[PDB]
């Protein structure tokens, strides 16, 4: 009941969207678009199956491109340290297997 009360208080606020955007990745400084993208990725989208039987995707993929020395890996480390289920992998270390069924 108490957690439900807190949740409904959260929803009641009319500035929820920007509050969540600001909260995400607190360590990094003022990257609103990237934080918004990470949030929307975390929420995800509805997956549906037509009358056919073919499946329409419902997940979101985001790629952050930037010059070195910028705050790219900080976002990734935050997601790894916050998301319910997640893994961290490197491009050079990873291979066809391990990144897929082996």
């Amino acid at each position: 009941s108490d957690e439900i009360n807190e949740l409904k208080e959260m929803v009641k606020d009319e500035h929820i969207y920007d509050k969540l955007v600001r909260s995400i990745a607190p360590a990094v400084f003022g990257h609103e678009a990237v934080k918004k993208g990470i949030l929307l990725q975390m929420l995800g989208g509805v997956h549906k199956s037509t009358v056919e039987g073919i499946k329409l995707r419902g997940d979101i993929n985001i790629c952050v491109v930037g010059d070195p020395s910028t705050s790219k890996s900080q976002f990734l480390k935050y997601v790894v340290g916050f998301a319910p289920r997640s893994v961290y992998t490197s491009g050079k270390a990873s291979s066809a297997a391990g990144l897929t069924a082996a």
């Binding site: 890996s73 961290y88 992998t89 270390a93």
Partner: protein, 611 residues
Amino acid sequence: EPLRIIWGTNVSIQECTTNFRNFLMSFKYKFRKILDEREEFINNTTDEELYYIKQLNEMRELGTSNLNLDARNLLAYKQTEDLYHQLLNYPQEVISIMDQTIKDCMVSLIVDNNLDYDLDEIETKFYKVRPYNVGSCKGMRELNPNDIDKLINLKGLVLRSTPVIPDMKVAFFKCNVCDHTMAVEIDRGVIQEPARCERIDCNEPNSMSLIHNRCSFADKQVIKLQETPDFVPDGQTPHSISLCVYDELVDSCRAGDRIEVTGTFRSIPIRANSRQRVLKSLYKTYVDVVHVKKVITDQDLAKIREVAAREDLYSLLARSIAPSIYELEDVKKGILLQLFGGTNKTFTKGGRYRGDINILLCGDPSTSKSQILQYVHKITPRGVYTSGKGSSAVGLTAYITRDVDTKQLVLESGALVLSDGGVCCIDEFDKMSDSTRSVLHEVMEQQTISIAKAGIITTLNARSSILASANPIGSRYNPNLPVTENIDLPPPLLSRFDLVYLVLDKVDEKNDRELAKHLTNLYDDVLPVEFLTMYISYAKEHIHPIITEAAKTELVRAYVGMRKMGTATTRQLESMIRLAEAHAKMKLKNVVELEDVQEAVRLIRSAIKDY
């Protein structure tokens, strides 16, 4: 009055016990000095005190059951001259007698001294002696049958050790009928089992059963020792000898370590087949280890704190790190600050921040680059001297393999992983394929390596400092063209390095003269390396600087000024922070002052060089 005597000899055990008790009771280290013709070195405090009495008292206070013994001390005394030979020739009986005498001495010390120490703890404790320095170190290729069942001394390299093996000590039997429990001892690996229940009312024969989980057990481990490479006569496969260690000495030596072991050179038969008493005529040889040696005081702390007060400490340390190198004070200073390292930060709501400094030494060929690399490689406690074109991308990080003994998938540690907490060294950075260099991108940024391939998904910590060197594309460095052209390497990579030095061998009539006079004398004091290592270790362990407001107020200014004159990115500000923290560590301060950060920024501008 039967007389106890060691089998096959004429030594009375009571004589051994009384002589050892007298030696322990009254022995002063001055005798050891007298024996070695060191009479003039005798003091009046340490050498006039009962050595082993203090050893036993310290044992009791710390609650330990081990007393390391020196045979040369036995030789020093008068009553125990023959005891040395007896120990050498009949190690097992003498060792057992010494253990029992040590226990008796402890009990007598407690009782006679009228101390309040409870007798229960000492009574139920097993005491063991570990003699060492028992004579010349025999070679692994000089052990003959003559030297069987005698105390020998060996040195070698550990190759592999088995996991802990439980060895039975006291068996436990329970009668199936009357549920009566009795404990029986084990002699020579044989259980003295009872034929029938020991009770009088119940005497049912063959009704006793062994309760496996109530018998007392000890620790056993088997190690393989390979002789040192030097002993190899004509370049063949080095020989190996097996060792057995029990109780405390278990898990005392790791794989790939040089140790000196004293033990009994035993021999044991091998059964021809599992289901018969038949034995092979050839006996297996092995060593029963009784001692293993792997080959800060308040006074030192009072001494160390004296150096820190010295005004010219920076110059002293920079001049002592690399005594031979001449007139490279800035390079030496930069190298030194890498050994100390920045300050460690544990940080939730985010990620850990590590104060590790990366230095690049790129310049003209003949200048002392590799020499400094070797000099630092010696000082650091951990590090791998990897080179260019002699290392691989996988070889640096980690290699996936399988364990034959366990038949399980395991992974080895690469050069970077093996340097966790040390300083990695790379010689030819330019002569390295960019495929392998991409590995270093994550090491210098996240201080971790993540591998996901062939069913292994795990991350290995690589919290190490990188010290690399590069040479110019041409035969020398040309000042005219910019830095990004002369040294190769991607421009972005050069920005990652905390400091990037540039040492060039200009031609002059005085610099060359002085250098020649300095490199020819081989055919301004510097601290001994032994003390310097302790200094850096103490500073790295205890001190932990914390930034002050004055530091931030001008650090913002310094970073913004660096960016204004224009390559300069946030990594430079983080490098300034790390360097300021590291320099404060040198002077043993818990607060970073304006002077230290000024020195850090001074070093950074004057490395690339102030055209």
